[PDB]
Every structure is written in structure tokens, then in C-alpha cells.
Design a protein around this ligand. Sequence first.
Ligand SMILES: Cc1c(C(=O)NCc2cccc(C(=O)Nc3nc4c(s3)CN(C)CC4)c2)nnn1-c1nonc1N
Ligand SMILES: Cc1c(C(=O)NCc2cccc(C(=O)Nc3nc4c(s3)CN(C)CC4)c2)nnn1-c1nonc1N
Lengths: 395, 358
Amino acid sequence: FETRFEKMDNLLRDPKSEVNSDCLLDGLDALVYDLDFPALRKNKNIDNFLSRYKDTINKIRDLRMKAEDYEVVKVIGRGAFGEVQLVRHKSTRKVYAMKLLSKFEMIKRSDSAFFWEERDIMAFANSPWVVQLFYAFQDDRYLYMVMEYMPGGDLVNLMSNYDVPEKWARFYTAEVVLALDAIHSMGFIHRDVKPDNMLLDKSGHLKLADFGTCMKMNKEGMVRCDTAVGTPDYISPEVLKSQGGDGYYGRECDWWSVGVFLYEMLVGDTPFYADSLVGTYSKIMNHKNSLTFPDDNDISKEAKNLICAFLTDREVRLGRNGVEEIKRHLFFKNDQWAWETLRDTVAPVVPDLSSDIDTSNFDDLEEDKGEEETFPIPKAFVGNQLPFVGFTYYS
Amino acid sequence: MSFETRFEKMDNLLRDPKSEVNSDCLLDGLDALVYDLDFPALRKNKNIDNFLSRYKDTINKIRDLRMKAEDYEVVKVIGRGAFGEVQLVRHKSTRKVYAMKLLSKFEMIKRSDSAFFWEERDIMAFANSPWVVQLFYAFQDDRYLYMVMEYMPGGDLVNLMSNYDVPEKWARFYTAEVVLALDAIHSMGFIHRDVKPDNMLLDKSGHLKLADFGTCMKMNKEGMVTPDYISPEVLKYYGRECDWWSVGVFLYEMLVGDTPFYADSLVGTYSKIMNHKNSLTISKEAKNLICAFLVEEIKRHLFFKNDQWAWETLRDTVAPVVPDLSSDIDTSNFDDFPIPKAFVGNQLPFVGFTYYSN
Ligand SMILES: Cc1c(C(=O)NCc2cccc(C(=O)Nc3nc4c(s3)CN(C)CC4)c2)nnn1-c1nonc1N
Ligand SMILES: Cc1c(C(=O)NCc2cccc(C(=O)Nc3nc4c(s3)CN(C)CC4)c2)nnn1-c1nonc1N
């Protein structure tokens, strides 16, 4: 009685627990969604359970957080399985960025387990380098992620609106180095470092916003993966050549991506850019001969040295012996800021905001694409809501 | 509605013991899901397989932490019914003594009789009446439903009637306790439909308590909803007066020593009940009560007129038979499945049964 009661109550209250109150309600909610079909209702056990719980689950669906609690202001982002909307909570009047992930697309593409690491990082990181997740909820169609709004926009937008000098490039590269080191300290390899995922707050400081490819390292700081992840232009040779029996790699793959980002910032183009995606694949693998700097040079000797130190083979790449050797590079030597107080110094671009719903730093996007896709009526139990049980988070 | 008053209303639903979606009921849902899905044929489905790999281990931890049959030491089997048995148990940790009823899930699924325990669970757990046997805990596994109830060491009234030549003074006491016990059930909005001495138990002081509520039904809109005690209206909507018929049968049996409509063939009993006008054959007022049954008007009857006790203080007076108990485990007053090829959900009609008082 006493030898067990303590451990059981911890499991129900703990926000990091798989069996907390919100996760247990997901189980019952998913069960009602997956069983409520006329063909399945022919079973006495399924029919009687639904007649007993369907009405009380409808009360729960109305009481719990739902999409109707939010007022959509504008679509500010788009991805493979959904979009990001600037929302305002109708009751609290608070402004957030809400990410929607299509359950249909996830089940169809057999990609329904990527969001767990993101949910854990964004909710429990408590880092000034990570975009905060306030709430996570769901319905039969979507997963919803109520995150902090980053009004400064992304670094792709900054690079397109500004001719980035080396002093600015030094600031953003150092912020990325510190942001990635925080992720490595949490026990993760990012595997998708790109300026699209790098967002700026109201003060103009950097935060990582996407963690969909994040994977936990072992005690040796390694990961075993048979499938290449990331983006065609920023992918390192070792994660690009991933396959069964040859996909063993460490955190240094994220440092390759920093070199690609630094090159892109100073040159205006990606180092391995090719009109054909396979052309880019060839260039990354042949980095020894494909990496070239343009004849008209405005970029310093130490800036080129950093790009080349990151854009090599993993065994000779900067970062292999820790983050300190990256910090000690001559490119980062300046009299404007210090590594330990960098996020306290004034950013190169500070956003000029007129309201709490100002989206001037975000490009315009389409809202209605007609109608999407839904799951067909099951003839037997399929359990399409089961991989999403335990996603709900509030705290 | 709205934030955060709907959050208060949601947190109430999770804590309330009478709620269908409290913490223990929600754990039953996940527990049932793991039991009903963990089969190799069902595991061929990617959604079923991945959910099980994600929750099976944590559900095993929960099964070990939550109340289970192993927490109780079985002393003796003291009762038996259609779908199970009643065991005298002792909780290994608290050392407390209870009566544990076991109900077979296999039999409940097979006979399409898996809803009778809900009214009993609600009555026994939330009655808070000295006339109703208390339910302290309700738990379950893949095979049984378990009901940890208060032990009634005095035994049942069938055992009392077989061990004693019951005088009218004793009959007056037990009939009045049944009248008060049934009125408490009617006040809760229920109709018993199985009033028999087998379901009438006595505590350590010798006072009556109703122990079985397997045939109880909630009184429709305002109030309009097993042999030989069965009434002609039930034997083929009716009211609570069908329970008063059974009191008359019980009073007759106590004073005569046989049931009024007794027959060697069960079919013969059925006919006798319907033909009660001609089939019904030592005080005048005792006979008048039996015939009146064959509320305040019951209490006002001349049979209950005595100088020993009063209706409002009856359970405080000394009982006719007080149990002589030697220990806390004294039982002297007591005599002595297929693997699914597809989802069937055999654990679903038992989701929400778990209850822990305090
Ligand atoms: C605009 C914006 C953003 C954004 O634009 N995020 C990108 C974004 C938006 C909407 C949906 C998705 C998406 O489908 N992702 C997937 N990943 C993976 C998928 S499918 C399958 N498999 C390949 C593995 C990884 C991505 N994120 N935050 N944010 C914000 N703007 O202001 N404040 C913010 N937090
Ligand atoms: C011995 C004892 C007792 C007892 O003897 N109870 C009788 C008893 C014991 C074990 C199982 C069952 C049972 O299966 N019932 C069903 N009902 C129904 C069923 S299946 C299907 N449908 C037709 C509706 C009604 C009944 N009840 N309490 N108790 C106690 N003794 O001490 N303290 C106690 N609480």
C-alpha cells in the first residue's frame, strides 16, 4: 500500500510522464474516434463502450483546448505536413505561432514519430536558444503546437533583405554555435541546421524553431541511422551517404551545416548549388574539388579558413574535439561581444514592430487550397489515432 | 466555458470519484487497450504495434503499482454465485479484513451479461448508509472484476432461520430493518427487484445490511421501472411496490418455515405466484401484514407496534442475535479465453470499474 502509492501519483502529475492526466485522456479520446463507425458498432463490446463514454468524451472535447479557442490572424509558415498560423487565444488575448501537422499525411507517408523529440525539446529545454512550446493539443485531423511568436522572421528573409557584412555574419554564426551546443548538451544531434529554422525574437536574437530531425546520441556521442535526413543544400557527406550498415555518425554533421550557412551568408549562394538536385549530391561528395570561393573577394582570410575547417571530411573537421576549438577560431575574435554575454549585446537587426500581430518580417502565403484529404471509413479496426496518444501538453 | 473556468470544470471531472473520466477510469482505458491489442495477428498493424512498443512497458509498471489480487491473503471462501465467489481476505500491507467478491469476465462476455455490476458499484460505494454493505475498493485484471467490501461476520438470514426457531419478536425486528433498508434504496432512486434473506447480512452487532444489488434499476422519469420472492408484475412498467411483495414473502417464510408459493417444480411456483388469490394458505396482525403485501403506511401497521424499539432508533437497540466472535477472521456464521484473429475488445465493458475510496 505505502511501498507503491508514492511512485504512482508522481506518474500522473509529471508533465514529462507518458501516463499523465492529459495523455490518459488522449487514449480514451482516440478510442472513441477509432471505434465510432457503423461496421465496428456491430460488435456488442464496441457499441456498449461507445454508448457509455461517447457523451462524456463530447463534454471533455468541449472543455479541453481546441482550434476554436484560437483566432487565426495570418498564415506565416508552411511545411510538408502542414502550416504555421499567427493566432490569438480568444480568452487570454495572448499571441502565439500555431503549427498544424496533418494526421492523414503522417499515416499515408508512414512518418508519425518525428514530432516526439520536438515536443520534448520545445516544451522542456528552458533555453533562450530554443523556441518555447506552451501547449500541444489535437483533434481527429491535426496535431497542434502553440509556440512563442518570433516577430523578427527567419534568417533566409534577413539574407534576402540585407547585404550581410562579416560583422553581422560573425554574430549569427556565434549564436548558431551556442544554440547547437545547447542541443548537443541535451543529448541530441539536430541534423537539419539551415537558416529557414533560425528565427529572431523582438530584440533580434536567434532561436532554433524546428527539431523534426533531432535524434538522441549514445554515451559515445554517436547515432546509427540508415536513412538520410536534412535539406539537399546543407546535408553533410556522411549523413547523405546513409544506408543500412553505413550510417554511423556524431554531432560534427551539424558543424558542416554551420560552414554551409556561413558561406551562404557571405557569398549569397550555397557552396554546392546546382540546378539539378543530383548535381548538388555530386558536389557535396566531391567537396575536395567542388568548394570554390568567387574571384571578387570581400570575405576575409579567417572567414574562408572557418568555412574550409567545417567543409571537410568528419575526421579532420573543426568541432570533432569539442565546441571550444570552434569558439577559439580567429574568425570569432572581435571587440564588440563575448561568448558568455553574446545574447545580452544589441543584435545587428532589431525588428520595428507596430503591433503584437505585426507580420512584416514574414512573406505572404496562400490560405485556402480548396479541400485537403481525410481517412476513409474503416471496415475493421485500423487505430489511426493510436500513434498520436500522449501528444497533449499544457503545464 | 471559458479559460480558466473550463480548466476548473475539467480538473473536477478528473478528481470526482463519481465521474466516468476520473484518473482510475482513464487508466482502465489504457490497460484494456494493451490487453485487447497485444496479440501477434493484431501486431501486424503498424499503428497497433508502435502504440504497444510505446506503452506496454509503462502499463506493466502501472499494473504492479495499482491494487491487485496479490495484495490480499485469502483466508476462506465464504460465498458463491453464478459468475464467481466471495473470499474472506486480509490486505497484506494494512492487515485489514474484508470480503472480496470475484466476477468472471469470461462468463460475463459469454452470457452477454456485463452491466449488472454498475448499479451495485454505485450503490455500495456511494450510499453512505448503515443499511448498505460498503464497497472500499473495486479493481480488475484481464480475468476478473474484484470488489473489496466490508465483512459481515453475523452471516445471512437464511443461516439464522436454519439455526433458530424465529419468534414473532425477532421477525418484527428483521422485517422493520428490511423496510428501512429498502426505503434507503428507494430514496436513492432505485428498485431492488431481488429482496431475499440470502442477500440480508448481519454485522458484528447483529444489525441488518443489504449486500447484493445485481438486479437494481434506476426509477425512470419520476419512478416507474430470483424465484420465489418474485412479484406477479415482474413475473409478467411497474413501481417500487414489487419490493414490498418480497418483504411479505420473507415475513411468511420467517414465521412459517417455508415460502408461501413453494413447489417442488419451479414451474409450479410460477403458477402459485400468479394465482396468489387462491394459493396463499401466528398472530392476527402478522397474517394481516403478509396479506397486505400479497412508506409510512407500512410503518403504521399494528404488527410493528411494540414497546421494545422505535423506527428512528431501531439500529441503536440490541439485536436478537449478537455474533460470538473469537477473532477478526471468525467464519463460524458461514457454511463450507480464445486468441483473437481481429479486434474484439473483450475488456471494453469493464473500463471505468476501478474505484479507490480516499
Ligand atoms: C514560421 C514558423 C515555423 C515553420 O515554418 N516551421 C516549418 C513547418 C511548418 C509547418 C509544418 C511543418 C512540417 O510539416 N514539418 C515536418 N517535419 C518533418 C516532417 S513534416 C516529416 N519528416 C520529413 C520529418 C520531419 C514545418 N516554425 N516556427 N515558426 C514561427 N514563426 O514565428 N514564431 C514561430 N515559432
Ligand atoms: C458472502 C457475501 C455475498 C454473496 O454471497 N454474494 C453472492 C455472489 C457471490 C459471488 C458472485 C456472485 C454473482 O456472480 N452475482 C451475479 N449477479 C447477477 C449476475 S451474476 C448476472 N445477472 C443475472 C444479474 C445479477 C454473487 N455478498 N456479500 N457477502 C459478504 N459476506 O460478508 N461480507 C460481505 N459483503
